[PDB]
Amino acid sequence: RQTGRGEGNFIIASRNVVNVLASVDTGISYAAQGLATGFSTDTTKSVFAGVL
Amino acid sequence: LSLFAPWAKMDERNFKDQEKEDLVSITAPKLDDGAREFEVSSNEAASPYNAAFQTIFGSYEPGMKTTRELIDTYRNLMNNYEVDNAVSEIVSDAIVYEDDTEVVALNLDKSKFSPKIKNMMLDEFS
Numbered sequence A: 001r002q003t004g005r006g007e008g009n010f011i012i013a014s015r016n017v018v019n020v021l022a023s024v025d026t027g028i029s030y031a032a033q034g035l036a037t038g039f040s041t042d043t044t045k046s047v048f049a050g051v052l
Numbered sequence B: 001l002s003l004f005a006p007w008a009k010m011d012e013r014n015f016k017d018q019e020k021e022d023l024v025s026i027t028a029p030k031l032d033d034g035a036r037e038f039e040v041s042s043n044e045a046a047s048p049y050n051a052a053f054q055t056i057f058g059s060y061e062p063g064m065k066t067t068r069e070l071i072d073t074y075r076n077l078m079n080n081y082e083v084d085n086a087v088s089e090i091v092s093d094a095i096v097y098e099d100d101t102e103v104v105a106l107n108l109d110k111s112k113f114s115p116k117i118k119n120m121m122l123d124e125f126s
Helices: A015-022 B002-020 B050-078 B083-094 B115-125
Strands: none
Touching: B050 B083
């Protein structure tokens, strides 16, 4: 709404936030959780965890 | 660099074919010779950022540094006496010329789609 250039497309966040994102099925489902899998959380390797 | 974008396109496609095939369950990297090692998860391809800086720097400060000493040594040997003749004779036998003869030439003695292609290869070779 504010930019008129398109909807946000990336998030920079804390380790905790990403761990949550990695551990939840971001797709549409009933509910879910498990071991962080979706994104990398290791800052020793990268900073880019993956895509929601 | 945009200067090499068309070549990058070719490398990307070649890389894709490697990704496409199940070239997996390999321990020691499938490399015979040439390039110096590095490993990283997918990075920003826009420019040679720090992962590349360290790779290159790592390939240059302890790397090219002594490679240069070796090449310069090889050249110093090449330019010395007697040893240079050995090189000359080797080079000469590998590369010779003669009056009204051929020079290196593509030998199209295998089955090919068509003689017209063979002719194109000969022209491309020339």
